[PDB]
Paper text:
The other conformation has CD-MTase-CTD averaged out due to the structural flexibility, with its RNA tunnel inaccessible to MTase, unfavorable for genome transcription. Following the same strategy, Lbody–P was determined at the resolution of 3.01 Å, and only RdRp and PRNTase are visible in L. The missing of appendage in Lbody–P indicates the structural flexibility in MuV L–P, as in other nsNSVs. MuV Lbody–P owns a flexible appendage, and its RNA tunnel is inaccessible to MTase-CTD, which is unfavorable for transcription. However, the RNA cavity formed by RdRp and PRNTase domains is available, with the potential capability for genome replication. Models in (c, e) are the composite atomic models of MuV Lintegral–P and Lbody–P via rigid body docking of individual models into their respective composite cryo-EM maps, which are B-factor sharpened.
L and P function as the RNA polymerase complex, responsible for replicating and transcribing the viral genome. P harbors an oligomerization domain (POD) for self-oligomerization, and the oligomeric P attaches to RdRp of L, tethering the polymerase to NC to extract the RNA strand for both replication and transcription. Here, we resolved two L–P complex conformations from the mumps virus (MuV), a typical member of nsNSVs, via cryogenic-electron microscopy.
Author numbering:
A (entry chain A): 4 to 151, 158 to 618, 658 to 1228, 1232 to 1299, 1308 to 1330, 1337 to 1415
B (entry chain B): 218 to 286
C (entry chain C): 220 to 304
D (entry chain E): 218 to 271
E (entry chain D): 218 to 267
Write the structure that this text describes.
Amino acid sequence: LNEILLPEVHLNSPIVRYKLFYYILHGQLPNDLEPDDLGPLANQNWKAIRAEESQVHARLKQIRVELIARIPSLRWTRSQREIAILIWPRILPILQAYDLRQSMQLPTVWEKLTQSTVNLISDGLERVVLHISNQLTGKPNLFTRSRAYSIPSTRELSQIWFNNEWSGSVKTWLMIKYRMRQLITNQKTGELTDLVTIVDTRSTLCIITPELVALYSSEHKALTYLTFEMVLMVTDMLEGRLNVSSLCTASHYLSPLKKRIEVLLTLVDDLALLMGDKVYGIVSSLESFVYAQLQYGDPVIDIKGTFYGFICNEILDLLTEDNIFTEEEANKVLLDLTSQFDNLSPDLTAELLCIMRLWGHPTLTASQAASKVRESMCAPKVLDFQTIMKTLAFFHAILINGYRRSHNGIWPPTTLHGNAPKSLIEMRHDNSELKYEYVLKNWKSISMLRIHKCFDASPDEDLSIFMKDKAISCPRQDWMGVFRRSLIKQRYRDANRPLPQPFNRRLLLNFLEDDRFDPIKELEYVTSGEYLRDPEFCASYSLKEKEIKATGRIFAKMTKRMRSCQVIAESLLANHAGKLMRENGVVLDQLKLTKSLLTMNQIGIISEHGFEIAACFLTTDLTKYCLNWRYQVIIPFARTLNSMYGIPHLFEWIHLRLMRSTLYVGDPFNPPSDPTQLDLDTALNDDIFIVSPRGGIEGLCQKLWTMISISTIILSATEANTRVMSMVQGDNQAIAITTRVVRSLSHSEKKEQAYKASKLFFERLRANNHGIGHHLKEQETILSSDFFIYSKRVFYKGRILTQALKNVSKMCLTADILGDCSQASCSNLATTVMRLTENGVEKDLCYFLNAFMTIRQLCYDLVFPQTKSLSQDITNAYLNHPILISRLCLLPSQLGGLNFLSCSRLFNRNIGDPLVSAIADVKRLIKAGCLDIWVLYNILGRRPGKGKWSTLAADPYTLNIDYLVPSTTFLKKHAQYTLMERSVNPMLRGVFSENAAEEEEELAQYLLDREVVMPRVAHVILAQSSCGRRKQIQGYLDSTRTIIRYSLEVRPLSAKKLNTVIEYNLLYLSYNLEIIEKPNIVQPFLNAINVDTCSIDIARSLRKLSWATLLNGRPIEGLETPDPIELVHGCLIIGSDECEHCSSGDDKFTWFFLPKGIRLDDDPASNPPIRVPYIGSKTDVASMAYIKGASVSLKSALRLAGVYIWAFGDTEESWQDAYELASTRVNLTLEQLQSLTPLPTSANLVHRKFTPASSYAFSSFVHISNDCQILTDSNLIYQQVMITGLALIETWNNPPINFSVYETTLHLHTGSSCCIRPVESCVVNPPLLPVPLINVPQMNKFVYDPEPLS
Amino acid sequence: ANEIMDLLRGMDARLQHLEQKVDKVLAQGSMVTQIKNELSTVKTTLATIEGMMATVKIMDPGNPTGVPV
Amino acid sequence: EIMDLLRGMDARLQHLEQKVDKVLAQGSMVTQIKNELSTVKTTLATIEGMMATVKIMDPGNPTGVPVDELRRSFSDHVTIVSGPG
Amino acid sequence: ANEIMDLLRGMDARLQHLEQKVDKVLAQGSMVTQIKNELSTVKTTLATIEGMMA
Amino acid sequence: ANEIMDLLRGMDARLQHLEQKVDKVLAQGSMVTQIKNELSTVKTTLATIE
Ligand SMILES: [Zn+2]
Ligand SMILES: [Zn+2]
């Protein structure tokens, strides 16, 4: 079992300083730590602690005596020796000193294997991309126009990835991490022998232990100790540095950033050595300085350089805070730090926000983390009662207006106060729109107005909320169980009290193993006030991982009942009250969100092609808002929300419970300093305790706070008589103040006028925020006439800045997920490469990088085996033949390979048929020479796998090939099944059944075993049926690492299952060895397929032979979709050129036009008019009866019936067959089912954070016209063609290029192509099989509704 | 004879005097109308004051509260 | 009949005179009430002016007093209304 | 002896005038009874707020 | 003639009724004393607020 639950490969936990200190002091390791540094650990009785844990102490003593023997000088005390013991933050400038190059062969073998494999496919990939450019533009310089400098191929990429700086460091820390993970795995199994590893490299001695490593560098005479989390963090940071430096070296776009990033890294490493853990304040100041430098180019003189100067002052304060540097040294350091950000384009100035994670993370202490929140929270705060009631009145107005525009424009049930004027009387009587200008006046009367019950909201409305695992704290009596037993044993022995019981329960497991669960009775915990009277309640903080800022270093955890009430209340707020606010543009659809943000940023840019429209953007982060929320500023809003929802006392729970309770920071190695503090309630407001908190907690009750902030923003906007559009995000907000200026004014003067108009709005907003208790400092406020910040992305002058280096920094050598398969890692690398394509990096370079890192990952997995195997035949066969490695890496993942990035994926996110794209890629590789035609013949002639009807129906477009599903998803499904099997919750009484797989197989066979097989129709019908609903509910579980471990423990895997999960990688490699080794003998009729055959025909034939066992010769219809690159034969027209396809026969094309004279980040009058580009089209029914408030079950049944009738026929027998599959989810009869069913024609057949598809730099000025074309598959095809054309236009002028001196026209002639085929459907398809006996959860509300109509 | 005429004349004159008295008394009611118009604002402002005071009292975090129904 | 036509007339008339002298006090009391209510408007304007801009501050816990002692807050939900109710 | 009839018609005329003015005076009195009721409510709510402030 | 003496007895009876309700009008004086008392109270109690 321990071979699956391997130690994590990447950092996921905070670095605890006291853990390392505990390990160092346990074995009496040499150190120069002051008594103040040790904190509470100095006064611990280490004799007893060493008496226990004797294996740990024995290992530590062994490494100590090895250190003494190797370095005799370490015995000297009082720091009179020449060797200095350094803790993690002070070893940054000496990371390159640790080499271990000798007595280390695995990294060298890995590098040699990667080079040998890459050397075989570089030219083929160059030919592939050349052919792609020739086919998509008609010219061979599509990808090389912006660079022509130097074109990096795959071999060049490998050379500059393995030969640059940090490469040796990455190899030596990868070996160290691998050895330490091996030692940890051995220790878990209880081997107890040879658990100390010594490498003893010349000038660098490293000793590896399952607990910590001891690294000594003779060149610098510095010895350091690193725990496992520290080693993971160091190797992750080194890998990120390697990726960033190599990408800067490779891409011409990021070439200027290389030297600046290197100089910044060196400067901050020296600063870290000189300072300690206080250099991460400087790192955060640099994070803010990126935006300060962005604001330095603002046209307005009054707003240019303010943030720059403030951030410089903050950096100087941080530098001179502890008197490490004098004024002149701090000034020189500041100048050196700032000189790396000057003379950079806005895109690059935002791609220096990648270096935040490049210096690791600070060593956290519970006391320091608690100090910040205790300073912010638990503080007196004076509030303005006029501001509170004005905000409440505008809250009422916004809620009323949001209830209007829906519900037939009818006012909610409201009660008018006695003071209300006659105008309010008539407006309530009339039910007209409450004008904000009207609400500003008579605010006393707008306030004090109650909105009575508006929603019949039910806590159990959403089921997915209850299925998400959340951390839950121990009761108030076991609050000391989080700390290590060794540290608290002496305290509990002195006090003569029993040791606290460790707490390991989870919220998800408590919910699932709850016999009597009901949200109606669960909310009574808060409704009846039992939470205030609960003595067991205990809320505690815990250190947050991968955090460098002082704020947000802790996240809180609460008891099971309180957490359940919190999630129920948040869901209640978001479902009904949250939807009423449309003043902010937040939507659950990312496409609409980015369109709204693009329009908001493009408000200010108006071209010459009266009074124009001008915008000034204001962005403020709300991270510190949570600690500053007070009960008195939220009581009226929450009181009105209580009245609206009908629950007498549901909200205001966080503050009321917090003022009565004492909070603490729970860290296993950070016990309270005072050994006499054995109880939480009587603790003092110091150390790790936060006595009587009066503020909020981050994330908790975020919806109410966001609505209050929206009301405040609206109030401020109306107070200054300025038009704004808010976009509050919870942790951030962006405001665009709108004003009307003269058209003839110069752009600088229009911006000045906009800033002058926005000054009053900003003053009112600051005054209102101060009134409600949120003081706005210069840190929070960034005023810019060009850009605003949303979702950590900068919207600069109608674009979105790239930040591709931030994406490339997290491209590591192994997925952190459980299975750790080669396929999962390759998929992660491909996803990161897709992000790089979207973020401005060269598409050709991205393709080469994806191939190179796929090869590198496979070589790493081959030469760094996670689990030792008795038979190494497969591994040796792959290691000795790099051509096999190349063939496997270049083969698409749909055919069994590890190439998860298709050629067409480089241009459009949406892919119709993955198999067609895979076939097109294989044909391209065969034409270039990367692969061989006999590989294609072997794939065509491959023996069908062990597939059933269920796998064909559940996941269409997939061939019958074994080992296409990684062991990771198998582990996730096993965890979900184990959770379902032991579940006893009433809400899931009938979800789980033992014959679920049999029922799914029978239904899939019924839907598929017909005259014509329709995998999409069967997939949709299965998903919308009862069994599909049960599968969805079972898949609602999160299946985290803890959940997977619990499932493996309570339900152990069989020996055969254990072995196959362990050796999935070797089994997959051996399975693909049958096709990537030698030309197999295939059937003679397969020779008709050639490299010139259309990918659609090849895909149809491959699906026919692959599923030959299941179908016995029947063809598969409804899946094929043209490959976007192969479908279109584009031509680019520059100046006097003409389209060859237009002049020769073809007359179908998608017209793309780019005007001339465009210059980004320049005068808006000069360039052609700007507009929101085409980012995509989502779902957008004419049913006989428009049922409002229809349940999910009713909609699912209606869609199932419609799809069945549309696909299998409109005969009465088909209607009876679909009646059963509809009645498995509703209680309709045939007549109501037929009447209520939507129109059964043109079935969509569609079924299954902020990542924009592009920067939209040059796609905003483009002109499109699809008039000369035919025009829901055709709509998807045309949308894909449009997106591909936009991507082609964007890559024609890469982010290195910012001007277009000539007008360009793109045609993308989709005609005269073999992939265009007529679409035929709606034929008669008799069942051919009796309808299976389907068990339906009649009593379950979330699957079946006995009353689907009112 | 003429004496009865003297009596009737004196009465009609006396009723005329009272008539002036009652029309004055009637004219007195305009400021009663004004005081009603101002007592309107009296109730309105008093209700506003009461409401402010109530929402200030509920804002104290010591005592948990709840909107009825 | 003439005596009857005069004696009761004069008696009723004197009663009218007395009631009229009683009634003219109405104008006086009414105008005094008017002025007093004008003063009520003057002072109510000030009381709103004072109540509109009021500071509400939560003292918080800067001293660090143990939470046990700071437990001077009710634990029972109480349903109070403000404007609507 | 007609003058007597003429003066008598005159007395009837001033009479009707007394009726109309006195009737509207009664209307004024009824409206002061309303005023009385409202101010009563003002006293009640003033007493309530006096209880609330202390 | 006698008809107008009868009519005038009618109008003086109505007159006595008018005086009857006129006597009822003065009843407001106690309540207006109460309203002045209200003023005194509100002044004394707004003195506390400042
Ligand atoms: Zn053309
Ligand atoms: Zn084709």
